[PDB]
Design a binder for these strands. Structure first.
Length: 52
RNA sequence: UUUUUUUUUUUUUUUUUUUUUUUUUUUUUUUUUUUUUUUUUUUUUUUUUUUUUUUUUUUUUUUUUUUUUUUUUUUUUUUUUUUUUUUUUUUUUUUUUUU
């Protein structure tokens, strides 16, 4: 899926019309958005205190 | 439906900086916000010392009675028509959730 390439089509997945249901979202991947964000909030980061 | 930092142009990151500076010190003197002199109870005329007293008195007691600010008699849930007894219910439903 060329994840690592900054000059590629992946970050414009939706607006290019390549895919309609992205496999990288919070709705597609809940409870991995709770993990990680909870860890960062418990590691005293102010960004993760606002994650839903 | 889709989403999920009320994040983001790129840069940047002391609500720091001319240069020089650093007692919101200083004329020189000075240093009781002391002092004429001499005094020192914001004492005293002499008397005097209950903001006591006419005498008499001494419950801010009393006419005599009296002594529940009780009582017609009867009574004694400031109960009761009967019936009743979720200030429940159409049916279906049951996140004041959702493209």
């Amino acid at each position: 899926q060329e994840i690592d390439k900054s000059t590629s089509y992946m970050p414009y997945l939706i607006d290019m019309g390549i895919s309609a249901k992205s496999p990288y979202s919070t709705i597609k991947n809940p409870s991995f958005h709770f993990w990680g964000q909870l860890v960062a909030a418990l590691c005293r980061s102010k960004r993760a205190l606002n994650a839903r």
